[PDB]
Design an enzyme around this catalytic site. Structure first.
Site, PDB file in Angstrom:
ATOM      1  N   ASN A   5      12.824   1.786   6.500  1.00  0.00           N
ATOM      2  CA  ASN A   5      12.039   2.943   6.912  1.00  0.00           C
ATOM      3  C   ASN A   5      11.937   3.471   8.234  1.00  0.00           C
ATOM      4  OD1 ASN A   5      10.947   2.179   4.176  1.00  0.00           O
ATOM      5  ND2 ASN A   5       9.562   0.446   4.943  1.00  0.00           N
ATOM      6  N   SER A  60      10.119  -1.090   9.715  1.00  0.00           N
ATOM      7  CA  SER A  60      10.242  -1.907   8.671  1.00  0.00           C
ATOM      8  C   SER A  60      11.322  -1.646   7.625  1.00  0.00           C
ATOM      9  CB  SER A  60       8.868  -1.730   7.912  1.00  0.00           C
ATOM     10  OG  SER A  60       8.790  -0.697   7.499  1.00  0.00           O
ATOM     11  N   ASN A 113       7.724  -4.152   1.347  1.00  0.00           N
ATOM     12  CA  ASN A 113       7.750  -3.602   2.882  1.00  0.00           C
ATOM     13  C   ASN A 113       7.525  -4.809   3.815  1.00  0.00           C
ATOM     14  OD1 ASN A 113       7.759  -2.089   5.231  1.00  0.00           O
ATOM     15  ND2 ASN A 113       6.651  -0.408   4.450  1.00  0.00           N
ATOM     16  N   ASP A 168       9.515   3.719  10.353  1.00  0.00           N
ATOM     17  CA  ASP A 168       8.905   2.983  11.318  1.00  0.00           C
ATOM     18  C   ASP A 168       9.592   1.687  11.718  1.00  0.00           C
ATOM     19  OD1 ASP A 168       8.262   1.422   9.385  1.00  0.00           O
ATOM     20  OD2 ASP A 168       6.218   1.231   9.106  1.00  0.00           O
ATOM     21  N   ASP A 209      -4.533  -4.713  -4.224  1.00  0.00           N
ATOM     22  CA  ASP A 209      -5.264  -4.388  -2.871  1.00  0.00           C
ATOM     23  C   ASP A 209      -5.921  -3.470  -2.847  1.00  0.00           C
ATOM     24  OD1 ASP A 209      -3.638  -2.051  -2.060  1.00  0.00           O
ATOM     25  OD2 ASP A 209      -2.371  -3.284  -0.680  1.00  0.00           O
ATOM     26  N   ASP A 258      12.231  -2.319   3.387  1.00  0.00           N
ATOM     27  CA  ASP A 258      11.856  -2.908   1.921  1.00  0.00           C
ATOM     28  C   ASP A 258      13.037  -3.362   1.300  1.00  0.00           C
ATOM     29  OD1 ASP A 258       9.824  -0.781   2.437  1.00  0.00           O
ATOM     30  OD2 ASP A 258      10.476   0.661   0.974  1.00  0.00           O
ATOM     31  N   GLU A 273      12.824   2.200  -7.632  1.00  0.00           N
ATOM     32  CA  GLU A 273      12.972   1.639  -6.448  1.00  0.00           C
ATOM     33  C   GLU A 273      14.284   0.725  -6.007  1.00  0.00           C
ATOM     34  OE1 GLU A 273      10.981   1.883  -4.137  1.00  0.00           O
ATOM     35  OE2 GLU A 273       8.878   2.506  -5.033  1.00  0.00           O
TER      36      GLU A 273
END
Ligand SMILES: O=C(O)c1cc(-n2cc(CO)nn2)cc(C(=O)O)n1
Ligand SMILES: O=C(O)c1cc(-n2cc(CO)nn2)cc(C(=O)O)n1
Ligand SMILES: O=C(O)c1cc(-n2cc(CO)nn2)cc(C(=O)O)n1
Ligand SMILES: O=C(O)c1cc(-n2cc(CO)nn2)cc(C(=O)O)n1
Ligand SMILES: [Cl-]
Ligand SMILES: [Cl-]
Ligand SMILES: [Cl-]
Ligand SMILES: [Cl-]
Ligand SMILES: [Cl-]
Ligand SMILES: [Cl-]
Ligand SMILES: [Eu+3]
Ligand SMILES: [Eu+3]
Ligand code: NA
Ligand code: NA
Length: 129
Positions: free
Chosen positions: A46, A50, A59, A48, A101, A52, A35
């Site tokens: 990203n 967003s 994110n 969209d 989650d 990270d 990562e």
């Protein structure tokens, strides 16, 4: 801060990530290597809009506030910049929520594609932990 491999393993273990939700320490170290290359200051945008952040590339669409991801959530209740600190506490505590989650470590694309199913213990071999 760019952590060394065993340095990061020790910090993650001290913060309770070893075997958290059943994921051994080597899974976390492998995920962080791919990562962020173990660099707490890593950021990546990203598609969209967003971003990270940090050693585990958390994110802003869901987990932290960066002020520029309109319509996003902040489920870790933290500024995304806290995830870039040399102190990994905020990244670890947020990661604990992410992996809980329901999707486990599949939340981390690099983990899915590069760590899952591999000999992850190799990432902590030689470390005194
Ligand atoms: O750059 C490396 O490949 C590297 C760096 C460190 N570092 C150790 C420290 C501690 O001051 N910083 N990087 C450890 C390792 C390894 O265990 O393979 N590898
Ligand atoms: O000593 C290390 O930790 C180390 C050394 C090298 N070295 C690679 C070469 C070239 O043959 N020399 N040291 C690579 C790495 C790594 O990829 O983690 N790590
Ligand atoms: O659990 C996630 O957040 C996750 C999982 C997958 N996974 C996809 C597959 C199978 O191809 N397994 N997890 C993709 C994505 C994403 O695009 O953000 N996200
Ligand atoms: O021996 C090394 O220098 C070394 C070996 C590995 N290994 C990673 C794996 C997993 O496939 N096996 N050794 C990682 C690192 C590093 O992250 O700095 N360094
Ligand atoms: Cl180290
Ligand atoms: Cl392991
Ligand atoms: Cl925002
Ligand atoms: Cl901007
Ligand atoms: Cl904030
Ligand atoms: Cl799981
Ligand atoms: Eu090395
Ligand atoms: Eu996803
Ligand atoms: Na282990
Ligand atoms: Na906040």
């Amino acid at each position: 801060k760019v952590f060394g491999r065993c340095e990061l393993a020790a910090a993650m273990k001290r913060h309770g990530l070893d075997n958290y939700r059943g994921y051994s320490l080597g899974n976390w170290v492998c995920a962080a290597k791919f990562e962020s290359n173990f660099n707490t200051q890593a950021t990546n945008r990203n598609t969209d809009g967003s971003t990270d952040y940090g050693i585990l590339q958390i994110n802003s669409r869901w987990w932290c506030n960066d002020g520029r991801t309109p319509g996003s959530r902040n489920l870790c209740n933290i500024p995304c910049s806290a995830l870039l600190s040399s102190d990994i506490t905020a990244s670890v505590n947020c990661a604990k929520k992410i992996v809980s989650d329901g999707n486990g470590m599949n939340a981390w694309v690099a983990w899915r594609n590069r760590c899952k199913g591999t000999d992850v213990q190799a990432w902590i071999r030689g470390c005194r932990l």
